[PDB]
Amino acid sequence: MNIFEMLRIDEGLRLKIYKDTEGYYTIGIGHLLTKSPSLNAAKSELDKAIGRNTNGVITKDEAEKLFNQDVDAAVRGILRNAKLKPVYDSLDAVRRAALINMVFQMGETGVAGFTNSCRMLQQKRWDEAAVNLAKSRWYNQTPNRAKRVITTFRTGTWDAYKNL
Ligand SMILES: *SCC1=CC(C)(C)N(O)C1(C)C
């Protein structure tokens, strides 16, 4: 298991524009196109992201290219962020993947706001961090995914993803 396989499980793969859990236009492996309610605004963002007139459909290779870009942007984003970099540097490799997963889903600003959870992760208080992370809109809105990410921070193993 690695971050790519973990996110593929959590996000799925869809080659036509769809709406995510929040109702936003998305494509591929969790690639948000726009928060706008217009399908035409979403098709324009998609064509710009891919570099051709797609008419709302992409290939598997194009979805994987967007995914590679998005993972790389999440990692570079964490490492440029003064609040997240210290947390990332403190963690083992499995727990680093759980932090990337959260940034990929929420964005850097959303994760930097989990102030108390950050501090507990930096202190290696795994069970206390797990409890604090679950007291969130994130957990209440996507509990199965959140439970897998929380388990990963609690244990430092891939157990929540093995058998999927
Ligand atoms: S959650 C962002 C964050 C990380 C850490 C370095 C522990 N910081 O004290 C805050 C809480 C800003």
Ligand SMILES: [Cl-]
């Ligand atoms: Cl879920």
Ligand code: NA
């Ligand atoms: Na998704």
